[PDB]
Amino acid sequence: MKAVYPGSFDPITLGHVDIIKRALSIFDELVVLVTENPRKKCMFTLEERKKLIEEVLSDLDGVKVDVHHGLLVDYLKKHGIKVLVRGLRAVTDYEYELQMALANKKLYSDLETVFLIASEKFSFISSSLVKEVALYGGDVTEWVPPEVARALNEKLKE
Amino acid sequence: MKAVYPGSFDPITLGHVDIIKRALSIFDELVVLVTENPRKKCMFTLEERKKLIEEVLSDLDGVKVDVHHGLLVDYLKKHGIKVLVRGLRAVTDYEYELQMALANKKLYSDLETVFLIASEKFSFISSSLVKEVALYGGDVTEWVPPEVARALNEKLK
Amino acid sequence: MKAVYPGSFDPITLGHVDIIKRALSIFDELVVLVTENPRKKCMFTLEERKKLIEEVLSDLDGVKVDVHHGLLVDYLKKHGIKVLVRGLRAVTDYEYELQMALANKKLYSDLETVFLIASEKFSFISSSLVKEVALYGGDVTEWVPPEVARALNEKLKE
Amino acid sequence: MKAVYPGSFDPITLGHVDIIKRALSIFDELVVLVTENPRKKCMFTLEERKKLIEEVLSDLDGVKVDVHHGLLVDYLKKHGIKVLVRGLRAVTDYEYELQMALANKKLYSDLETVFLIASEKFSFISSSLVKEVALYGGDVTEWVPPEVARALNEKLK
Amino acid sequence: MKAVYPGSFDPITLGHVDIIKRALSIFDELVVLVTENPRKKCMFTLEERKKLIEEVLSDLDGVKVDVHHGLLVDYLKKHGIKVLVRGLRAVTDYEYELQMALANKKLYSDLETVFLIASEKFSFISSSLVKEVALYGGDVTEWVPPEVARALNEKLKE
Amino acid sequence: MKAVYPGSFDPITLGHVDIIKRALSIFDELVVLVTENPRKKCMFTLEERKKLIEEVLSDLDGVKVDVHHGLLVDYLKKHGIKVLVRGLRAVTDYEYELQMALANKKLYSDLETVFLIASEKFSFISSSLVKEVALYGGDVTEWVPPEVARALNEKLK
Ligand SMILES: CC(C)(COP(=O)(O)O)[C@H](O)C(=O)NCCC(=O)NCCS
Numbered sequence: 001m002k003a004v005y006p007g008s009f010d011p012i013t014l015g016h017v018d019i020i021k022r023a024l025s026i027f028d029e030l031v032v033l034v035t036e037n038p039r040k041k042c043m044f045t046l047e048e049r050k051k052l053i054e055e056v057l058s059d060l061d062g063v064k065v066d067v068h069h070g071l072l073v074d075y076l077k078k079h080g081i082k083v084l085v086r087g088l089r090a091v092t093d094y095e096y097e098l099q100m101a102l103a104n105k106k107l108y109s110d111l112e113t114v115f116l117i118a119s120e121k122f123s124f125i126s127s128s129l130v131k132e133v134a135l136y137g138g139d140v141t142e143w144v145p146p147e148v149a150r151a152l153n154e155k156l157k158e
Numbered sequence: 159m160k161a162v163y164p165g166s167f168d169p170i171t172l173g174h175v176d177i178i179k180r181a182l183s184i185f186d187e188l189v190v191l192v193t194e195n196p197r198k199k200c201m202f203t204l205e206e207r208k209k210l211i212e213e214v215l216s217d218l219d220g221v222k223v224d225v226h227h228g229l230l231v232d233y234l235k236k237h238g239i240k241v242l243v244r245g246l247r248a249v250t251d252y253e254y255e256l257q258m259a260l261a262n263k264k265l266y267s268d269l270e271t272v273f274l275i276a277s278e279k280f281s282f283i284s285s286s287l288v289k290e291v292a293l294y295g296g297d298v299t300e301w302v303p304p305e306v307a308r309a310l311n312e313k314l315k
Numbered sequence: 316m317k318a319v320y321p322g323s324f325d326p327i328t329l330g331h332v333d334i335i336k337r338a339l340s341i342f343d344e345l346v347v348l349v350t351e352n353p354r355k356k357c358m359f360t361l362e363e364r365k366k367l368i369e370e371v372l373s374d375l376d377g378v379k380v381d382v383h384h385g386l387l388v389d390y391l392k393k394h395g396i397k398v399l400v401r402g403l404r405a406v407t408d409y410e411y412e413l414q415m416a417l418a419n420k421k422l423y424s425d426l427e428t429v430f431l432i433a434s435e436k437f438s439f440i441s442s443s444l445v446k447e448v449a450l451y452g453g454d455v456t457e458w459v460p461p462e463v464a465r466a467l468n469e470k471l472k473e
Numbered sequence: 474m475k476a477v478y479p480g481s482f483d484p485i486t487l488g489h490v491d492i493i494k495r496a497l498s499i500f501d502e503l504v505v506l507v508t509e510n511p512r513k514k515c516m517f518t519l520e521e522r523k524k525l526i527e528e529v530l531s532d533l534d535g536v537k538v539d540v541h542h543g544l545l546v547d548y549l550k551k552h553g554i555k556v557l558v559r560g561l562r563a564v565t566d567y568e569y570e571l572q573m574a575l576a577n578k579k580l581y582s583d584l585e586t587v588f589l590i591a592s593e594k595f596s597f598i599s600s601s602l603v604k605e606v607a608l609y610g611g612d613v614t615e616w617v618p619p620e621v622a623r624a625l626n627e628k629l630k
Numbered sequence: 631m632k633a634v635y636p637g638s639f640d641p642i643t644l645g646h647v648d649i650i651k652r653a654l655s656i657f658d659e660l661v662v663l664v665t666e667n668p669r670k671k672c673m674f675t676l677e678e679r680k681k682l683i684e685e686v687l688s689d690l691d692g693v694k695v696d697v698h699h700g701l702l703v704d705y706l707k708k709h710g711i712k713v714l715v716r717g718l719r720a721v722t723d724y725e726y727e728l729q730m731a732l733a734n735k736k737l738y739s740d741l742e743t744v745f746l747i748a749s750e751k752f753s754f755i756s757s758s759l760v761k762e763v764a765l766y767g768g769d770v771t772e773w774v775p776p777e778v779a780r781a782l783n784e785k786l787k788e
Numbered sequence: 789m790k791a792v793y794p795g796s797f798d799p800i801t802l803g804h805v806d807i808i809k810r811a812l813s814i815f816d817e818l819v820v821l822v823t824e825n826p827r828k829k830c831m832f833t834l835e836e837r838k839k840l841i842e843e844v845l846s847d848l849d850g851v852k853v854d855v856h857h858g859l860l861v862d863y864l865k866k867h868g869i870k871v872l873v874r875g876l877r878a879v880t881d882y883e884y885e886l887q888m889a890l891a892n893k894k895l896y897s898d899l900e901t902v903f904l905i906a907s908e909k910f911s912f913i914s915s916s917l918v919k920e921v922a923l924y925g926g927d928v929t930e931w932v933p934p935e936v937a938r939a940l941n942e943k944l945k
Pocket residue numbers: 006007008009035036037038040070071072073099100103104290291294
């Protein structure tokens with residue numbers, strides 16, 4: 001069965017990769033969906049983020065990476081996908097997640113949003129933390145794949 | 159007794175209408191006050207928002223709609239109003255509401271901020287949700303009055 | 316207009332007294348209702364609590380003190396009261412309040428639960444904290460009326 | 474694929490039944506597991522709760538109801554089940570759920586705890602609310618299956 | 631400078647040991663104070679707990695282990711200690727810690743309660759979790775010192 | 789022992805001054821570090837903020853005021869400081885403080901971030917609140933030092 005893992009992935013972290021790998025143990029097919037969050041000004045374009053994720057996930061079976069500019073549930077409806085996966089961390093805004101899950105279900109009544117728990121080691125990181133630290137030249141090697149560390153380093157020069 | 163229900167109402171949703179109606183069961187006179195939130199960029203002007211609300215509330219007795227550009231407690235002091243009504247949702251920033259209630263009371267010692275609980279159906283909606291969904295062409299009809307759905311549709315063109 | 320301010324008041328604190336005083340600015344008649352909480356083992360009997368509160372509020376106009384053993388909304392329906400007042404503190408279980416308000420409104424549709432915010436000075440106290448400190452002989456004089464400090468002291472000799 | 478939906482179910486509510494029906498959209502087999510919570514004193518025995526749930530879910534395909542007295546992950550390991558399903562409400566202790574998910578995953582590395590969101594209607598109810606209202610003679614009919622309203626009625630005599 | 635690390639320590643976990651080690655990098659003298667929490671029924675007596683802690687910390691310099699049955703601030707006042715150290719975890723009741731810090735500062739105005747953050751790995755563990763798991767015969771080896779795993783095993787036979 | 793109290797101090801409030809005074813009873817040397825928060829647009833420059841704080845703390849022994857534009861831990865590493873002090877309020881985003889403490893300790897393994905509790909009177913105030921109220925011409929006298937009230941008044945003209 002198919003699921004979508006939607007997110008800004010700006011950039012993708014090792015926490016995200018963990019959720020992807022784990023989600024694949026429940027859903028045979030996973031779409032990692034780089035989707036526009038209108039409440040964020042992103043560092044990387046949607047396509048830059050897609051290419052990064054593809055490099056990073058390159059030898060996982062069962063995973064496809066895509067981008068979406070519109071209403072999330074329209075992507076799912078169009079492709080006949082009825083499951084959304086999201087990760088929950090200690091630093092997650094829980095009411096935000098609930099609000100969106102409930103809103104999405106109202107817009108798409110067949111939808112199920114399924115949450116996995118971040119492991120302890122990734123429960124307090126975020127893309128935002130990663131970018132902030134990299135932008136001041138800190139080491140983010142333990143939080144992101146090497147592809148992403150390179151990409152961040154370049155963007156901090158450009 | 160008179161109370162002010164202050165908010166961005168950008169736009170007013172069914173959750174807001176519910177708090178208005180319920181607040182009127184306690185306070186015989188309610189001022190719905192469209193007030194500037196300096197931490198928000200608003201979709202509709204203060205006056206567009208007043209007009210929607212007036213259309214929406216248009217046969218409710220006991221309600222007046224107004225706008226205010228300054229310090230909220232100044233409106234209440236000038237009009238002799240000593241009660242502020244606000245709604246509490248599952249998705250409400252509780253510390254923000256407390257902070258603001260306490261700051262307002264510091265500024266205006268006779269003030270009481272009184273909170274009502276949003277019903278379950280409205281406890282996870284907000285104007286922000288409504289606008290985001292409308293802006294991507296989703297149906298917001300379950301969350302807003304039809305006057306507002308119309309207004310949002312126009313604004314999105 | 317009539318309102319009920321229901322609670323364990325076990326014992327009543329200066330924080331409760333503040334909410335009573337403030338609620339009386341909005342509601343002409345206030346019933347302070349000593350109500351059984353089935354999730355607590357109380358220190359004082361319902362009647363001991365009623366008596367302390369009466370001593371403590373003795374010269375406030377507009378306040379009546381009463382006790383109730385049953386379903387809270389039944390007290391209100393019986394007496395034609397449609398407003399419940401509760402205080403909100405930094406240490407309040409917000410979800411429990413919200414749950415109870417919404418349950419109470421499902422049981423009694425005309426009901427409105429209204430919340431006042433505890434002042435900063437009382438926003439981190441509770442009857443529980445008071446009892447625990449008095450139990451170990453600490454001074455609770457800044458948190459409770461003198462009558463209550465007295466009653467606590469006696470109870471911790473018994 | 475099999476999952477276990479573990480809980481006190483003391484008693485089962487319409488919120489739990491909703492999660493069960495929805496989980497069955499994802500998992501082909503669901504074990505509803507009446508499991509001992511050592512931080513709770515139950516109203517009904519584990520076996521009373523099992524019988525109630527079996528009455529309630531009687532014509533749902535794909536569900537089994539069972540009881541477990543020990544460590545949750547031991548039941549899953551024993552039966553080769555590697556998914557746990559839980560529900561998330563507005564009134565859920567989030568940090569408790571995370572703790573327990575993380576602890577269970579430590580104890581059983583192949584485990585995944587999967588969370589579904591309770592609908593708005595069921596996001597502010599709990600078994601504990603139901604029992605407290607029932608015990609004071611309040612109507613809990615909109616929160617529990619009729620079977621459970623009956624059982625609560627009897628127990629309170 | 632002297633500090634007290636007060637707690638139930640029922641039993642001491644690796645999370646507590648981490649806080650102790652780290653607090654010693656700031657405070658040259660640390661008193662680990664096994665103190666009675668009246669809102670808990672403890673598994674081990676205060677003396678059992680002291681003994682376990684002493685076994686566990688046996689070759690740490692700068693640490694003393696003690697017990698206290700009364701009001702915490704009375705121990706501190708008696709011994710001229712003005713700093714209390716507590717740990718903060720993702721599963722900490724933050725309002726309970728604040729309440730108690732503020733209450734303690736009210737009862738002893740010179741006191742400062744200082745909080746350290748638990749590491750990610752210990753941020754979701756508690757003595758309570760440990761005891762629940764052990765009680766049902768689960769491995770708590772990664773969460774407690776071996777002395778404690780042994781003590782827990784014995785207690786679960788007794 | 790030396791500690792850094794880092795913050796935007798935009799502007800410094802009486803709550804910050806209280807944490808400074810109290811931190812000085814534990815740490816014989818305190819550096820108040822005006823540091824860039826990249827998630828905020830500041831009202832005052834780093835140097836305006838440094839100068840305010842210096843006026844405000846002028847007769848406190850043991851305190852130095854400084855500014856830093858980069859990674860916070862780099863300031864500490866450079867100066868051999870291994871303690872960071874922060875304040876906890878009712879209105880503090882706890883998860884954010886935790887996240888940053890843990891991240892900082894990852895980047896600088898000798899570091900301890902140590903938290904003091906804001907007194908009740910300061911537990912619901914913030915520089916943001918102050919700015920918002922001052923902006924609308926409200927009295928912020930009870931929340932900031934008179935030097936800061938003045939500075940805010942100027943800025944608003
Ligand atoms: C990108 C995301 C999925 C949120 O993910 P994020 O937390 O990784 O930013 C986004 O907010 C989203 O859903 N965008 C599309 C708009 C939409 O479908 N719904 C918003 C109303 S629920």
